[PDB]
Amino acid sequence: AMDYQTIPSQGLSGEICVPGDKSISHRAVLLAAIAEGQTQVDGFLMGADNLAMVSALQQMGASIQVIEDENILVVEGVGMTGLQAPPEALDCGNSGTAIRLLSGLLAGQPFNTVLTGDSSLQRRPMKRIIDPLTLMGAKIDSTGNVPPLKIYGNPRLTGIHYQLPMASAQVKSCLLLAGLYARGKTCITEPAPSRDHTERLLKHFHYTLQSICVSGGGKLKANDISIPGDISSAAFFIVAATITPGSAIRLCRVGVNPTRLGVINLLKMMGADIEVTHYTEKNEPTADITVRHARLKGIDIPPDQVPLTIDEFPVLLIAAAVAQGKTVLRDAAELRVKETDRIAAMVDGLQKLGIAAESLPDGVIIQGGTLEGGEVNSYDDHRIAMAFAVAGTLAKGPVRIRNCDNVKTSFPNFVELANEVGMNVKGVRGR
Ligand SMILES: [Cl-]
């Protein structure tokens, strides 16, 4: 509901999976919808952007059954040519990824589609995909190179070899999809190799791929898929179990990034008790994460990790609040407004929960202490709202978190997952 109310936890326990992120979730259902056969998708993020993708595919005749509370989809593929013109404009909500992937998928279809979304989405730039898509023969009308986009399906799409002056996995993913419906082969080359989840998903669905090249005329084969859990969503539970006495949990199949330091490792530096096991590379790289309660010490976050901490794992600041000593985030230069606002909200909430915290022009400083019960404002930022729900696990009293509407729309299963592991949170009427 509008506000979240928590009460202190007796200690977390149990095993859960957290959903994957938006990007992999979109790609999985999209590829499954045009495959032949039935695909069961586990770990599908059930937020508004991902369900907007689902409803769009259904408008075009896809068979997708949604089990929201279990993060499951069961897709009966309609084949490469089973999509049909939607009767109305496809509303992509706030999803830039949805509109861009759908533009690639629909450019080579033998029908027309209008793609739009909310006012935020109607300002998102689209030239980067429109031009390359036009080279393959796409007919995409738009004003100001932003949505709405009217795609006049071109069944005569032809493959292209594309040489980019800068890396971009968003363009690549779009062209790979358009390539599935284009004559000959479509190839994408970059100065440096960019992120490649689309490529692995294509292989998972048994499409042939040969820089990165794909050919039209091939066929997608249904194949069950378990989306790796988003480390950002998992971080909430990792911190919860780390700071709450008597806690022991296991997070199954969480996507792990081996090339970066990360939240698990920053937590380990604070003295956390985390075991990463059962590492596999057949999904993105995946692992089970076992977390037990552990006393923590404040650390100096290296500059390179400051933006990432604030952007992706602000719940790490909740762990700093209960550690012994101070934790310091100082970036080389003053932070961007998005970062500055985020830290100001975290600092203000922490202060309201009796923690000594100061915002800096290039970061923040947290004096480790004791979280008290009280009231904070999430400022409709789901990451902030969730971080304070986690602070509630150890707070001396109940914590009320105002304006949590965006948690339901970004990560709706948070509340049920929190409760299932012993972390008390319930939606209540606000203001
Ligand atoms: Cl969810």
From Swiss-Prot:
<keyword id="KW-0963">Cytoplasm</keyword>
<feature type="binding site">
    <location>
        <position position="169"/>
    </location>
    <ligand>
        <name>3-phosphoshikimate</name>
    </ligand>
</feature>
<dbReference type="InterPro" id="IPR013792">
    <property type="entry name" value="RNA3'P_cycl/enolpyr_Trfase_a/b"/>
</dbReference>
<feature type="binding site">
    <location>
        <position position="97"/>
    </location>
    <ligand>
        <name>phosphoenolpyruvate</name>
    </ligand>
</feature>
<comment type="subunit">
    <text>Homodimer or homotetramer.</text>
</comment>
<dbReference type="InterPro" id="IPR023193">
    <property type="entry name" value="EPSP_synthase_CS"/>
</dbReference>
<dbReference type="GO" id="GO:0009423">
    <property type="term" value="P:chorismate biosynthetic process"/>
</dbReference>
<feature type="binding site">
    <location>
        <position position="23"/>
    </location>
    <ligand>
        <name>3-phosphoshikimate</name>
    </ligand>
</feature>
<feature type="binding site">
    <location>
        <position position="170"/>
    </location>
    <ligand>
        <name>phosphoenolpyruvate</name>
    </ligand>
</feature>
<feature type="binding site">
    <location>
        <position position="124"/>
    </location>
    <ligand>
        <name>phosphoenolpyruvate</name>
    </ligand>
</feature>
<dbReference type="GO" id="GO:0008652">
    <property type="term" value="P:amino acid biosynthetic process"/>
</dbReference>
<protein>
    <recommendedName>
        <fullName>3-phosphoshikimate 1-carboxyvinyltransferase</fullName>
        <ecNumber>2.5.1.19</ecNumber>
    </recommendedName>
</protein>
<feature type="binding site">
    <location>
        <position position="22"/>
    </location>
    <ligand>
        <name>phosphoenolpyruvate</name>
    </ligand>
</feature>
<dbReference type="InterPro" id="IPR001986">
    <property type="entry name" value="Enolpyruvate_Tfrase_dom"/>
</dbReference>
<keyword id="KW-0808">Transferase</keyword>
<dbReference type="GO" id="GO:0009073">
    <property type="term" value="P:aromatic amino acid family biosynthetic process"/>
</dbReference>
<dbReference type="InterPro" id="IPR006264">
    <property type="entry name" value="EPSP_synthase"/>
</dbReference>
<feature type="binding site">
    <location>
        <position position="342"/>
    </location>
    <ligand>
        <name>phosphoenolpyruvate</name>
    </ligand>
</feature>
<dbReference type="Pfam" id="PF00275">
    <property type="entry name" value="EPSP_synthase"/>
</dbReference>
<dbReference type="InterPro" id="IPR036968">
    <property type="entry name" value="Enolpyruvate_Tfrase_sf"/>
</dbReference>
<keyword id="KW-0057">Aromatic amino acid biosynthesis</keyword>
<feature type="binding site">
    <location>
        <position position="96"/>
    </location>
    <ligand>
        <name>phosphoenolpyruvate</name>
    </ligand>
</feature>
<feature type="region of interest" description="Phosphoenolpyruvate">
    <location>
        <begin position="94"/>
        <end position="97"/>
    </location>
</feature>
<dbReference type="GO" id="GO:0003866">
    <property type="term" value="F:3-phosphoshikimate 1-carboxyvinyltransferase activity"/>
</dbReference>
<feature type="binding site">
    <location>
        <position position="311"/>
    </location>
    <ligand>
        <name>3-phosphoshikimate</name>
    </ligand>
</feature>
<feature type="binding site">
    <location>
        <position position="383"/>
    </location>
    <ligand>
        <name>phosphoenolpyruvate</name>
    </ligand>
</feature>
<feature type="binding site">
    <location>
        <position position="338"/>
    </location>
    <ligand>
        <name>3-phosphoshikimate</name>
    </ligand>
</feature>
<comment type="function">
    <text>Catalyzes the transfer of the enolpyruvyl moiety of phosphoenolpyruvate (PEP) to the 5-hydroxyl of shikimate-3-phosphate (S3P) to produce enolpyruvyl shikimate-3-phosphate and inorganic phosphate.</text>
</comment>
<dbReference type="GO" id="GO:0005737">
    <property type="term" value="C:cytoplasm"/>
</dbReference>
<feature type="binding site">
    <location>
        <position position="27"/>
    </location>
    <ligand>
        <name>3-phosphoshikimate</name>
    </ligand>
</feature>
<comment type="pathway">
    <text>Metabolic intermediate biosynthesis; chorismate biosynthesis; chorismate from D-erythrose 4-phosphate and phosphoenolpyruvate: step 6/7.</text>
</comment>
<feature type="active site" description="Proton acceptor">
    <location>
        <position position="311"/>
    </location>
</feature>
<keyword id="KW-0028">Amino-acid biosynthesis</keyword>
<feature type="binding site">
    <location>
        <position position="168"/>
    </location>
    <ligand>
        <name>3-phosphoshikimate</name>
    </ligand>
</feature>
<feature type="binding site">
    <location>
        <position position="170"/>
    </location>
    <ligand>
        <name>3-phosphoshikimate</name>
    </ligand>
</feature>
<comment type="similarity">
    <text>Belongs to the EPSP synthase family.</text>
</comment>
